[PDB]
């Protein structure tokens, strides 16, 4: 479209920033898409939530149902619960959309956690990027609380119990402020008339706006501080080796977006999540057995379950037990964003870093991370006590005490094992550097001796033994077939062979192109 392109060029003349953005190089490691997963989940959340806002009515006034769902006719409920039932049963395709919304929220949280694990273990938070780590931590906290406020909207029995217990009766117990916070937030005592509209406003407008601003800032910082990379053949602290945006990277990103949307649609159509009609409207007099929040608050619930009943009563006052949960959760939320500064104070290393570390080269940090993950898993499993004790025949008090003791003895055990495992991996790497790659072939050496036919990775000395290499922070091959050793199948389709000339030509050109890629990337 020559005329339109030229007229855009005389009116705006970008032609240089477009060239500067079309030539940007991005590294290609499978581990660098765990943030794209979260970004795409957030986009799907935005779209489905904008759809949902056209049918939801966030009031707490009481009505009688008089709808299509018969086992609930004549029951008195709030207006939000009725609006959610109307979305579920009286809009063509509404149940599908809210199920997609909930599944996308779950995938958002899970992808954020996996991305954080990557960032922590590879060491991508060092000198140039502590602030980007901090922004990520804030994003994590906001996502947690946004999901909570979200699933507490269509007030039914389970959401009501969660709200009541956690919000009302942990805010009510804080030492001095306490009830003042409770009355500022609820407008009075727990079941009010302004809670659900306030949560609705917080959930559709404020927290999404803050999250959008922080995500923009995060991606800008990642764009202008170029990406990190793993050590390898042609990689230095001064260059980025990968593919340009122009043909390839946008294509791969868009295809990944479409595949994630496909997975979310499939599992939002085939699996059922939050069937609010099986529950009832919230009433302060009735309860059920499950309880349980979504899996990103289960650690908070489990911590409240397995913490012993230690209270303090002094003059004319009372400090209850959930205060402990409050300070422990605050301590966790404060220890997360302040980790890079702690590590740089303790190790005393303040240099710029653009090459990542393999998790096996840093045993102490890997052990710390494994200990934290074990602690989190214990806290999460201590939240499904009832389900575990019912399905697997175990006592309930037994599960409580198992959690209460594991909380102390599992983290150090995991630390010890992880440290020893990291050093074992290092030794296994050094052995294949010193000798060659084991091929698995045995010989008998006419004077009855068995050898195993190693294969060298570099030069050899006078008597056939390879000269040992030096470690360079890059992974080493361990299987002979990963190196081209046994390959080149036929060149048919699946049941009929091709000609021999075609097979030879294709094999030979493929070999040539492989060798040229190798020789080109070495030499730079």
């Amino acid at each position: 479209l020559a005329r339109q392109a030229e007229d855009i060029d005389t009116r705006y003349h970008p032609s240089a920033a477009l060239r500067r953005q079309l030539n940007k190089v991005f590294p290609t490691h499978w581990s660098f898409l765990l943030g794209e997963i979260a970004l795409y989940s957030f986009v799907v959340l935005l779209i489905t939530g904008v759809y949902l806002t056209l049918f939801f009515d966030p009031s707490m006034v009481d009505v009688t149902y008089n709808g299509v769902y018969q086992p609930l006719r004549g029951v008195e409920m709030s207006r939000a619960y009725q609006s959610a039932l109307d979305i579920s049963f009286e809009v063509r395709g509404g149940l599908f959309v809210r199920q997609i919304h909930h599944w996308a929220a779950l995938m958002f949280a899970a992808a954020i956690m996996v991305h954080l694990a990557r960032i922590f273990f590879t060491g991508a938070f060092r000198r140039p990027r502590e602030t980007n780590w901090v922004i990520g931590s804030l994003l994590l906290i906001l996502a947690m609380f946004e999901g909570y406020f979200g699933y507490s909207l269509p007030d039914d029995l389970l959401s009501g119990l969660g709200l009541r217990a956690a919000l009302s009766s942990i805010t009510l117990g804080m030492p001095v402020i306490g009830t003042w916070l409770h009355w500022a937030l609820f407008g009075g005592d727990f079941p009010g008339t302004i809670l659900i509209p306030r949560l609705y406003a917080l959930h559709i407008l404020l927290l999404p706006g803050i999250i959008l601003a922080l995500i923009g800032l995060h991606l800008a910082l990642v764009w202008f501080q170029k990406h990190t990379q793993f050590p390898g053949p042609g990689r230095t602290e001064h260059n980025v080796v990968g593919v340009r945006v122009m043909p390839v990277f946008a294509f791969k990103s868009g295809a990944f977006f479409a595949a994630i949307v496909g997975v979310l649609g499939l599992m939002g159509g085939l699996l059922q999540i939050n069937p609010i009609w099986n529950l009832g409207p919230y009433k302060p007099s009735q309860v059920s057995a499950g309880s349980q929040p979504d899996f990103y608050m289960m650690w908070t619930e489990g911590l409240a379950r397995i913490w012993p009943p230690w209270e303090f009563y002094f003059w004319h006052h009372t400090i209850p037990a959930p205060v402990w949960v409050a300070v422990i959760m605050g301590l966790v939320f404060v220890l997360l964003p302040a980790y890079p500064f702690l590590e740089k104070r303790f190790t005393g290393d303040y240099a710029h870093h653009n090459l990542l570390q393999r998790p096996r080269d840093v045993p102490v940090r890997t052990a710390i991370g494994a200990m934290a993950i074990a602690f989190y898993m214990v806290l999460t499993l201590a939240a499904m006590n009832d389900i575990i004790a019912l399905k697997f025949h175990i006592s309930l008090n037994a599960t409580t005490w198992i959690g209460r003791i594991g909380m102390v003895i599992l983290p150090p055990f995991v630390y010890f094992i992880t440290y020893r495992w990291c050093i074992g991996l290092q030794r296994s790497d050094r052995s294949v550097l010193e000798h060659g790659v084991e091929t698995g072939i045995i010989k008998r050496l006419p004077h009855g001796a068995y050898i195993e036919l190693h294969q060298p990775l570099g030069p050899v000395d006078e008597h056939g033994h390879p000269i040992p290499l030096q470690y360079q922070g890059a992974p080493l091959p361990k299987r002979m077939n990963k190196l081209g050793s046994a390959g080149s199948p036929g060149s048919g389709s699946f049941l009929f062979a091709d000609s021999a000339a075609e097979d030879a030509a294709l094999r030979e050109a493929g070999h040539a192109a492989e060798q040229r890629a190798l020789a080109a990337l070495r030499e730079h």
């Binding site: 030539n23 940007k24 190089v25 009481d62 004549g74 008195e76 140039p128 009541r164 009830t179 003042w180 409770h182 009355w183 500022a184 407008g187 009075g188 005592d189 727990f190 079941p191 501080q225 170029k226 042609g234 602290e237 001064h238 260059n239 980025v240 080796v241 990968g242 593919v243 340009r244 043909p247 390839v248 294509f251 009433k283 302060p284 007099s285 710029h352 653009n354 192109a513 890629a517 080109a520 990337l521 730079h524």
Partner: protein, 161 residues
């Protein structure tokens, strides 16, 4: 799509000294030229004024939400109490009868009916609510409001063993 490899020339680190010196000179000259450094009175009055405006504005912004949890608003038999100490089981005129009504789950006339001690065996449990016969059954809108407020009170339910 063809296979490719590229290299990007990071150019990280501090800026070239040219840009650092020029931008710091620009900032310093813009600051020293205003002569504000040797004007103490203007600066300090400006500070106090902005601080007072900001404080007053923020207090007015966050002042409509704050409520006192201990103001007496609930009428009882010894005056008026705070909400967090009344229960609905609290007597109102010094000697009123409060029955232990039970829920029936239907809305023809009774959502709450009185109870007798013989309506239970030695291994039973039942939830009960305060009745106050002046509330009546749920026919009119006034009694319906009274009953729907009895049913939703976070300190009302009681187990009868």
């Amino acid at each position: 799509i063809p296979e490719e490899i590229s290299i990007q020339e990071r150019h990280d680190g501090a800026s070239r000294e040219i840009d650092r010196k020029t931008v710091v000179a620009n900032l310093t000259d813009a600051f020293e030229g205003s002569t504000i450094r040797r004007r103490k009175l203007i600066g300090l009055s400006f500070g106090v004024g902005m601080g007072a405006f900001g404080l007053g504005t923020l207090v007015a912004f966050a002042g409509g939400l704050i409520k006192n949890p201990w103001k007496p608003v609930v009428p009882t038999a010894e005056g008026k109490k705070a909400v967090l100490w009344t229960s609905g089981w609290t007597p109102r005129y010094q000697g009123e009868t409060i029955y232990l009504a039970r829920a029936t789950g239907t809305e023809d006339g009774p959502p709450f009916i009185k109870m007798r001690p013989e309506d239970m065996d030695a291994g039973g449990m039942e939830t009960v609510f305060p009745w106050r016969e002046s509330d009546g059954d749920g026919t009119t809108v006034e009694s319906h409001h009274k009953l729907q407020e009895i049913a939703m009170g976070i300190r009302n339910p009681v187990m009868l063993i």
